[PDB]
Amino acid sequence: SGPVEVFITETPSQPNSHPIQWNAPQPSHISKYILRWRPKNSVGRWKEATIPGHLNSYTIKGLKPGVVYEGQLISIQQYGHQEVTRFDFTTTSTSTPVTSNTVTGETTPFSPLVATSESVTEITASSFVVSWVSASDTVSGFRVEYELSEEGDEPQYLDLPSTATSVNIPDLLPGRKYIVNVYQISEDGEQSLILSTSQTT
């Protein structure tokens, strides 16, 4: 038939989650609804899902911040005809420091320390173990976000199943304060703050 109807709503911008919605004809012309998407970066492998004919909205989790994903909506008929629709969207955490771009000029900022040693080290221990309560059984998964309460570096997100009620955050910088916020993702892709706390490695 002809392309299905899809649009973005109540979606100002999410970090790891991204909810979508679609509409179909009035008559029982379409039965099953299938949604497939992939991060505008490759045409090899991607994700797909099936949505009952009674549902008109999906939920996408495990997305990467500052990245764009292309989605397609396919409507199948009782072992009859088939239709495919294509759409695309972007995913952002929101606003963050240093996000803006710097400008080159005659100014020469200071450069502490000279060159780099032959050998360098990464991050060790300083991990964190935070647990919360699935303040909701309708949660489809959980999303943890932690960032430096000082430097303000870029925020990181971790996705866990609706059955997860605790997670360990590794690769933490010792002697640094981090802000942790746990959000639960509903079947609609909505996030709700259930636990917010800071810690000092």
Swiss-Prot record:
Site (Important for superfibronectin formation): residue numbering on this chain: 55, 58
Modification comment: Sulfated.
Outcome following mutation: residue 34 to A: Little effect on ability to form fibronectin aggregates
Outcome of swapping residue 33 to A: Severely compromised ability to form fibronectin aggregates
Superkingdom, natural source: Eukaryota
Tissue spec: Expressed in the inner limiting membrane and around blood vessels in the retina (at protein level). Plasma FN (soluble dimeric form) is secreted by hepatocytes. Cellular FN (dimeric or cross-linked multimeric forms), made by fibroblasts, epithelial and other cell types, is deposited as fibrils in the extracellular matrix. Ugl-Y1, Ugl-Y2 and Ugl-Y3 are found in urine.
Result for mutant: residue 83 to A: Slightly enhanced ability to form fibronectin aggregates
Effect of residue 86 to A: Slightly enhanced ability to form fibronectin aggregates
Known disease link: Glomerulopathy with fibronectin deposits 2: Genetically heterogeneous autosomal dominant disorder characterized clinically by proteinuria, microscopic hematuria, and hypertension that leads to end-stage renal failure in the second to fifth decade of life.
Subunit structure: Mostly heterodimers or multimers of alternatively spliced variants, connected by 2 disulfide bonds near the carboxyl ends; to a lesser extent homodimers. Interacts with FBLN1, AMBP, TNR, LGALS3BP and COL13A1. Interacts with FBLN7. Interacts with COMP. Interacts (via type III repeats 9-14) with TNFAIP6 (via CUB domain); this interaction enhances fibronectin fibril assembly. TNFAIP6 may act as a bridging molecule between FN1 and THBS1. Interacts with TNR; the interaction inhibits cell adhesion and neurite outgrowth. Interacts with FST3 and MYOC. Interacts with SVEP1.
Function: Fibronectins bind cell surfaces and various compounds including collagen, fibrin, heparin, DNA, and actin. Fibronectins are involved in cell adhesion, cell motility, opsonization, wound healing, and maintenance of cell shape. Involved in osteoblast compaction through the fibronectin fibrillogenesis cell-mediated matrix assembly process, essential for osteoblast mineralization. Participates in the regulation of type I collagen deposition by osteoblasts. Acts as a ligand for the LILRB4 receptor, inhibiting FCGR1A/CD64-mediated monocyte activation.
The protein's name: Fibronectin
Residues of the full protein shown: 609 to 809 of 2477
